[PDB]
């Protein structure tokens, strides 16, 4: 079972700058089988990225992945106040599609 | 080597330990094209070309067949029909130096794209303006070769990956490089399907007193049928006789 | 860099017959105490061989270019083996990759790469009076190399590289065959005690090595190395060198095999009716008696065509290029 | 495209419940539906997936034997059944999309419903 | 080839007021590739500014550029007696990079 | 960071001379080296640049054929050779460093050496 640990648990602290959110796994993510999610408070998560860097419909390309092997990046180039939301990871490689613990949680 | 000065070595006239590389698994990316990680890797190769170059982690994706980018179009192009493997492994300890190591260079801009095996070592300054550069670096003149600047404390995307592109064509008529071929053990004194060095047959093996010449593998007696064969595993000559049969 | 030799006198090649020479094992298959008949490229018995002789006794180097047949026999009678390889390249100008054999005292290297080979190929070895050594200081054969299709290397071997004059102690037999872009070299060593005579000895040549040239090849060259005690091109000492070149022609050949598996003796069915009846009988001895050997037929001089041609030209243009179909 | 979720359930402990995720037209046949727990003040846990066309439901080791997944091919509605309300089973269950195919090997959660809050009461 | 003429060639004495020493070029400086230099007597020139106004390490921000096109300003808040060095301009464009003639030469 | 060079040259007219600007560690590879004439009682004249890593030296029209630029990758030392001492060649030669890379503001002489005096005598 491939566990995921998000490393910056509360780096955001109401951030006004570009971020470097991370995810790391016990066995290397094979074939970029990872995704990110946008969970605005009081609402359901919304898909942000798939593969390693492939973007999503209706989500601006300012959200940028940059991962390989232990896929680890979600980079908001210009951060927007409405965009604030706990961000989750999920690996559909070997795992029973398990998630991380959340990186931008208050 | 640096990406612009991609170094090539020719792997010729040797058997190759393809299995052990897979066993090591020290490589983050093992994207193989055409040959695949299979028995097809462990077979005859006409020529093996090895190319080494230290590139950005983010640019590893670019050096795949039918992909475009700065590294792809200005430093090392990729065959669209590429038959071979692309390996990227982290060299963060080895290839990053404190305060940055600025010895590995890359070509940000070039006049045109490059051929699949083009090694441009030119130092001519790229010109983007109506003014000729004349060997002085100024406005409208920007040096093509820029230094990546790997740093020890940096993201792995900004950390070095040593890349050893291995080109294997699949015609295999010269067969200069081959795999181990999965030699087995000897099981004599019983009827067995034998295949010593490429001749499939049925029969029982026994000790042979015949002395084969060094350039001879298998022997044929009168009426042109196999009688003795030399296994090259331990240069041993063994007599082939049919196992027992007859009418009832 | 290539510099050609100068002052070398040229004489027409002598004509000698080569009989029961140049036969090689047809296949790698081992045969013990079996008489085997096979059709393969073989030197015909009593064949004319062009004789190029280098004798110090201007100084008679004779290493001209020779056309490459499908099978080539290269008997060399040399005590010190002054000859150092051959160039099996048609162009010789770096247009195509060419097989090169070079023999040096330090190492022996075989290559199949394009090179700017010289018009006349030679290897220069120099000797010093104060200190006794022989080394090759001239590498005319190696010039600039472009991208290469195949690369080959050979195990280092040490040879005397010293010119000798006298009776040839040993004879080296070479058979060169190229099939489907793959080159076969056959090597034999036989001791001889003849000043310039070709002896009456049967010889069987084992395949030394097999190399893929990878290109269509129709021409080969011979490299003769010189030994010297100014400018090198003007003056040199040949030594005693004799080499014979013959061309293989496909023939049915009857070969004896001993218990060892080496060819005991071989005979050429085609030259002699007695030999052909031997091969039909499958024994080296003919039984007394008349035996139906082959069939005789006459081939024709020309071709007579006897169907008249009409002056009118067929209107295929009318049918094919018609306005309306 | 829209996957409206059932309302909050007033389930006394030990009493079973079945959620009602509602699929839009063309949603069940092409893509799979997957269920995530989203426990209160905590992360997301993958309960399992449902392919409605083939009726195949596979669960994780943790949730096996505790939850039942059913889907209705007619009326295009997705259901999740809880065997009984254990004390930790309080959560905000979510139903989302999947791909389950070859060419698209990305089995990510495309669209998520509003969610259903189960608890001891309201 | 580009020429440069510095306009205030020499100020004999120090009154300490700010001086707006200037540089002008035959063809307008492109991308503001100009730098100023401090050449104290008996010593080598030291970089004072680069670009159009970007300051330098160890040189106080009292030294201020204010140029565009034909880049022409280097200003100082007050003229120190010790800080009375000849100031040079060198373009770093593809031309031969031939310096000006100096604006504070006694 | 520190570029100690040659100080003064005792060269009779017509006799060649070589200057010995010394680069500190990490200076030669990252940065190019530039030469400035600084003629006596006169302005600063850009002689040219040495790109040490790729051994590229390009000169202005005036100084072409009269001066030679060389740099030693090992020992990190910059050299300039004067073909012969012409009468006007008297000067205070200077060595300075600029960055060839366009991704960092460059081509402007960051730091300078002490200066090399060539004259008829001392
Ligand atoms: C076969 O393998 C063994 C063990 O590696 C080795 O000792 C032996 O020389 C090999 N035989 C040949 C013909 O290479
Ligand atoms: C010599 O070789 C030629 C072929 O070039 C052949 O016609 C001739 O019969 C041979 N023998 C003599 C004695 O000329
Ligand atoms: C000694 O031998 C070497 C190698 O043959 C040769 O280069 C050299 O000229 C000889 N003589 C002397 C005096 O060294
Ligand atoms: C060999 O490959 C080089 C590398 O691109 C190419 O420039 C050249 O045309 C090729 N052919 C020859 C004959 O050199
Ligand atoms: C050999 O000649 C044939 C002529 O039909 C040509 O098609 C082929 O390309 C040639 N091979 C090489 C290696 O030049
Ligand atoms: C093989 O050759 C040897 C000579 O080396 C001979 O004595 C022997 O009789 C031959 N035949 C065999 C071993 O059958």
């Amino acid at each position: 079972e491939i566990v995921l640990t998000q490393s910056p648990g509360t780096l955001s602290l109401s951030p006004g700058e570009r971020a470097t959110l991370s995810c790391r796994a016990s066995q290397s993510v094979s074939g970029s089988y990872l995704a990110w999610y946008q969970q605005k408070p009081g609402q359901a998560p919304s898909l942000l990225i798939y593969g390693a860097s492939s973007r999503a419909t209706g989500i601006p390309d300012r959200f940028s992945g940059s991962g390989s092997g232990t896929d680890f990046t979600l980079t908001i180039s210009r951060l927007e106040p409405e965009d604030f939301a706990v961000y989750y990871c999920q690996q559909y490689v070997n795992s029973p599609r398990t998630f991380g613990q959340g990186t931008k949680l208050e | 080597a640096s990406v612009y000065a991609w170094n090539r070595k020719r792997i010729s006239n040797c058997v190759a330990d393809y299995s052990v590389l897979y066993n090591s698994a020290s490589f983050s990316t093992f994207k193989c094209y055409g040959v695949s990680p299979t028995k097809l890797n462990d077979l005859c190769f006409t020529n093996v070309y090895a190319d080494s170059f230290v590139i950005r982690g983010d640019e590893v994706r670019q050096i795949a067949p039918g992909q475009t980018g700065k590294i792809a179009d200005y430093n090392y192009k990729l065959p669209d029909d590429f038959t071979g493997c692309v390996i990227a492994w982290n060299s963060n300890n080895l290839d990053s130096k404190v305060g940055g190591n600025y010895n590995y260079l890359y070509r940000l801009f070039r006049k045109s794209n490059l051929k699949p095996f083009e090694r441009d070592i030119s130092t001519e300054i790229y010109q983007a303006g109506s003014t000729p550069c004349n060997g002085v670096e100024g406005f409208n003149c920007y040096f093509p070769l820029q230094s990546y600047g790997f740093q020890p404390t940096n993201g792995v995307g900004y950390q070095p990956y040593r890349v050893v592109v291995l080109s294997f064509e699949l015609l295999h008529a010269p067969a200069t490089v081959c795999g181990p071929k999965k030699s087995t053990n000897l099981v004599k004194n019983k009827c067995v399907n034998f295949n010593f060095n490429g001749l499939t047959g049925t029969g029982v093996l026994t000790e042979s007193n015949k002395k084969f010449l060094p350039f001879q593998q298998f022997g044929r007696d009168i009426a042109d049928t196999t009688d003795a064969v030399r296994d090259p595993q331990t240069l041993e000559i063994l007599d082939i006789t049919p196992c027992s049969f007859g009418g009832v | 860099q290539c510099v050609n030799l100068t002052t070398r006198t040229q004489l027409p090649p002598a004509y000698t017959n080569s009989f029961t020479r140049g036969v090689y094992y047809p296949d790698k298959v081992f045969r013990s105490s079996v008489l085997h008949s096979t059709q393969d490229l073989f030197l015909p018995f009593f064949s004319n061989v062009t004789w190029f002789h280098a004798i110090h006794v201007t100084k008679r180097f004779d290493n001209p270019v020779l056309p490459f047949n499908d099978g080539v026999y290269f008997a060399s009678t040399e005590k010190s083996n002054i000859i150092r390889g051959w160039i099996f390249g048609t162009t010789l100008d770096s247009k195509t990759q060419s097989l090169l054999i070079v023999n040096n005292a330090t190492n022996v290297v075989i290559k199949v790469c394009e090179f700017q080979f010289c018009n006349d190929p030679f290897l220069g070895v120099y000797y010093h009076k104060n200190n006794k050594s022989w080394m090759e200081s001239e590498f005319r054969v190696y010039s600039s190399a472009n991208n290469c299709t195949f690369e080959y290397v050979s195990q280092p071997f040490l040879m005397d590289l010293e010119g000798k004059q006298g009776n040839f102690k040993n004879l080296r037999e070479f058979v060169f065959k190229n099939i489907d872009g793959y080159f076969k070299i056959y090597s034999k060593h036989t001791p001889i005690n003849l000043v310039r005579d070709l002896p009456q000895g049967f010889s069987a040549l084992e395949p030394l090595v097999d190399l893929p040239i990878g290109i269509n090849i129709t021409r080969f060259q011979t490299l003769l190395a010189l030994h010297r005690s100014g400018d090198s091109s003007s003056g040199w000492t040949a030594g005693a060198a004799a080499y014979y070149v013959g061309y293989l022609q496909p023939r049915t050949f009857l070969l004896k095999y001993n218990e060892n598996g080496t060819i005991t003796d071989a005979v050429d069915c085609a030259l002699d009716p007695l030999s052909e009846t031997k091969c039909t009988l499958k024994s080296f001895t003919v039984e007394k008696g008349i035996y139906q050997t082959s069939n005789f037929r006459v081939q024709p001089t020309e071709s007579i065509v006897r169907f008249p041609n009409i002056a009118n030209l067929c209107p295929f243009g009318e049918v094919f290029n018609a306005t309306r179909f | 495209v829209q996957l409206v979720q059932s309302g909050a359930e007033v389930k006394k402990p030990g009493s079973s419940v079945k959620v009602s995720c509602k699929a839009s037209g063309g949603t069940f046949n092409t893509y799979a539906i997957n269920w995530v727990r989203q426990a209160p003040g905590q992360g997301l846990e993958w309960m399992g997936r449902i392919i409605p066309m083939f009726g195949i439901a596979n669960y994780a080791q943790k949730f096996q034997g505790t939850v039942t997944f059913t889907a209705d091919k007619s009326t295009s509605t997705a259901y999740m059944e809880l065997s009984s309300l254990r004390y930790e089973d309080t959560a905000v269950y979510y139903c989302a999309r999947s791909a389950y195919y070859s060419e698209s090997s990305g089995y990510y959660l495309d669209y998520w419903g509003q969610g259903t809050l189960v608890t001891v009461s309201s």
Side-chain angles (χ1 to χ4, degrees), chain A, chain B residues 1-180 183-248, chain C residues 1-309 311-325, chain D:
Chain A
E1 188 266 330
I2 175 173
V3 290
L4 260 182
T5 48
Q6 316 190 12
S7 308
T10 306
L11 80 167
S12 54
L13 200 62
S14 316
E17 82 288 327
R18 88 284 182 274
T20 180
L21 282 45
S22 178
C23 274
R24 298 291 181 91
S26 63
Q27 309 95 22
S28 190
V29 182
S30 314
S32 315
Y33 272 50
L34 195 148
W36 275 94
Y37 294 100
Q38 190 155 322
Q39 192 189 69
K40 276 76 61 168
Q43 296 173 358
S46 159
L47 180 77
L48 270 161
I49 202 163
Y50 47 94
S53 62
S54 315
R55 264 73 151 178
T57 313
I59 294 88
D61 287 5
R62 71 181 159 229
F63 274 104
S64 178
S66 187
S68 282
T70 44
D71 297 13
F72 74 117
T73 302
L74 187 69
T75 42
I76 313 96
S77 298
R78 178 81 271 148
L79 186 60
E80 284 68 34
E82 96 272 357
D83 271 341
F84 291 164
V86 56
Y87 292 127
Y88 280 90
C89 285
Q90 191 219 22
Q91 76 284 3
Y92 53 102
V93 55
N94 200 332
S95 67
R97 306 172 28 77
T98 77
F99 292 76
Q101 77 271 3
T103 181
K104 191 180 284 185
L105 184 63
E106 181 68 17
Chain B
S2 306
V3 70
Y4 74 103
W6 56 265
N7 187 24
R8 173 164 280 183
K9 203 267 171 186
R10 173 182 276 261
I11 298 296
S12 64
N13 303 273
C14 50
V15 181
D17 268 0
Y18 283 125
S19 54
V20 305
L21 62 87
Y22 299 112
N23 302 335
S24 64
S26 311
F27 53 81
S28 50
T29 76
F30 204 59
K31 290 198 263 298
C32 291
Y33 317 101
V35 177
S36 314
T38 46
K39 193 57 209 55
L40 321 167
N41 200 355
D42 200 298
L43 64 89
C44 309
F45 281 141
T46 73
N47 315 283
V48 173
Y49 287 162
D51 276 329
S52 64
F53 44 87
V54 179
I55 73 178
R56 167 178 288 272
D58 284 341
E59 299 298 271
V60 167
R61 299 179 293 267
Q62 293 196 355
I63 192 48
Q67 186 142 352
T68 52
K70 57 168 178 298
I71 299 313
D73 71 351
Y74 294 149
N75 294 271
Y76 191 53
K77 190 77 67 68
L78 53 87
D80 53 316
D81 47 354
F82 187 51
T83 63
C85 291
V86 164
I87 63 165
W89 83 90
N90 200 23
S91 43
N92 185 52
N93 52 341
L94 300 176
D95 289 351
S96 69
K97 160 204 167 184
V98 190
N101 59 315
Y102 309 100
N103 56 7
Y104 300 103
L105 271 284
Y106 65 101
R107 258 187 165 272
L108 270 171
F109 324 104
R110 184 181 190 258
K111 275 70 157 177
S112 75
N113 299 354
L114 78 165
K115 192 263 290 179
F117 305 144
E118 164 79 28
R119 201 183 320 184
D120 199 15
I121 306 300
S122 67
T123 72
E124 208 265 340
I125 184 161
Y126 174 76
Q127 295 103 11
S130 62
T131 50
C133 204
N134 309 307
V136 188
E137 309 184 2
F139 202 69
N140 297 317
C141 283
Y142 313 106
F143 207 61
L145 292 147
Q146 298 287 107
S147 179
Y148 190 87
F150 303 110
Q151 289 90 24
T153 58
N154 220 358
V156 57
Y158 290 94
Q159 288 175 344
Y161 283 176
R162 283 165 169 192
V163 183
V164 186
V165 159
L166 268 177
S167 176
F168 309 150
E169 56 267 17
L170 266 74
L171 72 162
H172 74 68
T176 197
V177 168
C178 311
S183 288
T184 66
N185 204 9
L186 197 57
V187 54
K188 63 166 43 168
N189 302 343
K190 296 292 187 291
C191 200
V192 74
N193 317 280
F194 72 96
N195 190 11
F196 287 2
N197 205 352
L199 73 164
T200 69
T202 70
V204 62
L205 279 295
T206 187
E207 287 296 324
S208 180
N209 54 4
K210 306 178 181 291
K211 323 294 280 153
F212 274 37
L213 288 168
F215 62 95
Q216 314 195 282
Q217 319 301 314
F218 66 90
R220 287 178 181 174
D221 71 325
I222 303 99
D224 275 3
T225 187
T226 311
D227 206 353
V229 64
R230 179 225 304 278
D231 55 85
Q233 160 66 249
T234 177
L235 72 164
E236 186 69 29
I237 299 139
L238 294 175
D239 189 359
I240 294 277
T241 61
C243 53
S244 66
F245 64 93
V248 168
Chain C
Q1 168 69 48
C2 280
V3 177
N4 259 328
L5 290 179
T6 74
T7 81
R8 160 174 154 196
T9 196
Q10 54 266 13
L11 274 299
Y15 279 170
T16 317
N17 57 331
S18 300
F19 42 84
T20 197
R21 278 258 168 219
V23 59
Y24 57 86
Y25 307 83
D27 57 357
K28 314 283 183 66
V29 190
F30 169 87
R31 272 163 217 273
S32 161
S33 310
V34 190
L35 185 44
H36 178 220
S37 169
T38 175
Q39 170 97 4
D40 209 0
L41 269 288
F42 278 119
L43 193 87
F45 285 15
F46 289 75
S47 297
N48 202 347
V49 295
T50 46
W51 188 6
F52 310 103
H53 199 302
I55 180 72
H56 152 70
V57 72
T58 182
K59 278 316 163 288
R60 209 63 164 76
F61 284 172
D62 196 352
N63 49 329
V65 190
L66 276 79
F68 172 72
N69 205 237
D70 54 357
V72 159
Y73 180 40
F74 209 102
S76 56
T77 43
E78 276 168 3
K79 154 173 59 171
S80 64
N81 285 333
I82 77 157
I83 191 165
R84 318 294 162 159
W86 304 269
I87 302 96
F88 315 114
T90 317
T91 71
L92 279 299
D93 300 325
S94 296
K95 316 200 172 93
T96 55
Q97 330 283 332
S98 300
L99 175 53
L100 166 67
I101 321 291
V102 164
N103 198 296
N104 299 321
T106 59
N107 313 280
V108 163
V109 62
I110 301 174
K111 196 145 284 287
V112 188
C113 204
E114 57 192 4
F115 291 114
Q116 289 80 249
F117 312 100
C118 315
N119 201 22
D120 284 288
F122 62 88
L123 206 48
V125 69
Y126 197 52
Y127 160 82
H128 273 121
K129 309 283 153 191
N130 73 9
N131 70 16
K132 320 217 190 175
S133 60
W134 286 96
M135 61 286 298
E136 63 93 17
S137 307
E138 270 317 314
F139 51 105
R140 290 282 185 263
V141 194
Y142 281 170
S143 307
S144 85
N146 319 119
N147 72 65
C148 199
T149 308
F150 172 69
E151 205 54 70
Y152 192 65
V153 76
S154 177
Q155 207 257 327
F157 165 76
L158 193 147
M159 188 178 286
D160 51 274
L161 271 76
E162 182 272 341
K164 279 183 157 92
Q165 301 86 4
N167 192 306
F168 311 119
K169 266 303 284 186
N170 44 2
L171 200 167
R172 275 283 171 99
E173 288 103 302
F174 301 104
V175 159
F176 304 133
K177 192 194 200 143
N178 185 78
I179 45 170
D180 66 270
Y182 199 43
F183 207 94
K184 289 196 281 192
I185 294 160
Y186 290 69
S187 171
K188 194 47 166 70
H189 181 278
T190 174
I192 46 164
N193 293 106
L194 278 300
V195 290
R196 256 172 192 174
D197 186 68
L198 191 53
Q200 305 93 18
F202 158 78
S203 284
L205 292 66
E206 311 94 332
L208 176 86
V209 69
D210 210 355
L211 281 73
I213 195 175
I215 61 166
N216 300 316
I217 170 171
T218 62
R219 297 294 292 271
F220 81 106
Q221 276 194 356
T222 293
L223 197 147
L224 208 51
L226 72 165
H227 311 260
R228 62 162 71 252
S229 188
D231 178 83
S232 303
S233 80
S234 63
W236 34 263
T237 289
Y243 74 87
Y244 307 171
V245 193
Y247 297 137
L248 266 49
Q249 282 84 20
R251 292 178 188 266
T252 313
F253 210 69
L254 181 73
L255 288 62
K256 209 163 284 292
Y257 279 91
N258 46 61
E259 299 102 4
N260 306 111
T262 284
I263 302 184
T264 315
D265 193 78
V267 69
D268 206 321
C269 319
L271 77 164
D272 268 345
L274 171 78
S275 185
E276 190 175 1
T277 193
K278 264 175 250 176
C279 312
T280 60
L281 283 172
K282 291 299 175 128
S283 43
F284 265 57
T285 56
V286 192
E287 281 69 76
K288 184 215 69 58
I290 171 167
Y291 295 107
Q292 189 273 331
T293 299
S294 69
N295 306 271
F296 176 64
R297 187 179 296 113
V298 297
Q299 326 300 116
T301 43
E302 294 96 7
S303 312
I304 76 183
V305 170
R306 295 283 307 124
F307 41 89
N309 318 295
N312 185 240
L313 202 65
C314 278
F316 280 131
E318 165 207 353
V319 194
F320 282 72
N321 265 331
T323 45
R324 169 73 189 188
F325 278 56
Chain D
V1 285
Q2 183 64 255
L3 304 166
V4 285
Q5 199 81 41
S6 81
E9 306 288 330
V10 191
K11 289 308 149 72
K12 183 76 57 187
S15 71
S16 189
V17 56
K18 172 182 301 278
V19 192
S20 290
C21 186
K22 176 68 184 71
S24 287
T27 288
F28 278 175
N29 50 3
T30 54
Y31 302 106
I33 295 290
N34 45 36
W35 300 87
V36 288
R37 185 185 322 172
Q38 184 38 60
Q42 198 265 11
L44 289 159
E45 307 146 26
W46 189 81
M47 311 187 54
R49 54 137 178 81
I50 56 160
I51 299 167
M53 189 47 81
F54 299 110
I56 301 297
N58 293 115
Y59 304 76
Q61 178 62 227
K62 154 81 176 64
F63 294 94
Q64 264 164 0
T66 77
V67 56
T68 312
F69 288 164
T70 73
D72 212 357
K73 197 159 306 173
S74 58
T75 77
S76 64
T77 308
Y79 309 104
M80 170 292 268
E81 190 263 350
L82 183 59
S83 299
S84 63
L85 192 150
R86 184 67 200 110
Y87 274 77
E88 87 275 343
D89 287 350
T90 56
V92 183
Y93 300 95
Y94 278 121
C95 52
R97 305 290 286 160
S98 182
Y100 89 93
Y101 278 149
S102 174
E103 60 258 9
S104 162
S105 63
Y107 318 109
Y108 39 94
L109 290 74
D110 306 318
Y111 185 77
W112 301 54
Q114 65 87 28
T116 296
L117 174 66
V118 306
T119 57
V120 165
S121 284
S122 301

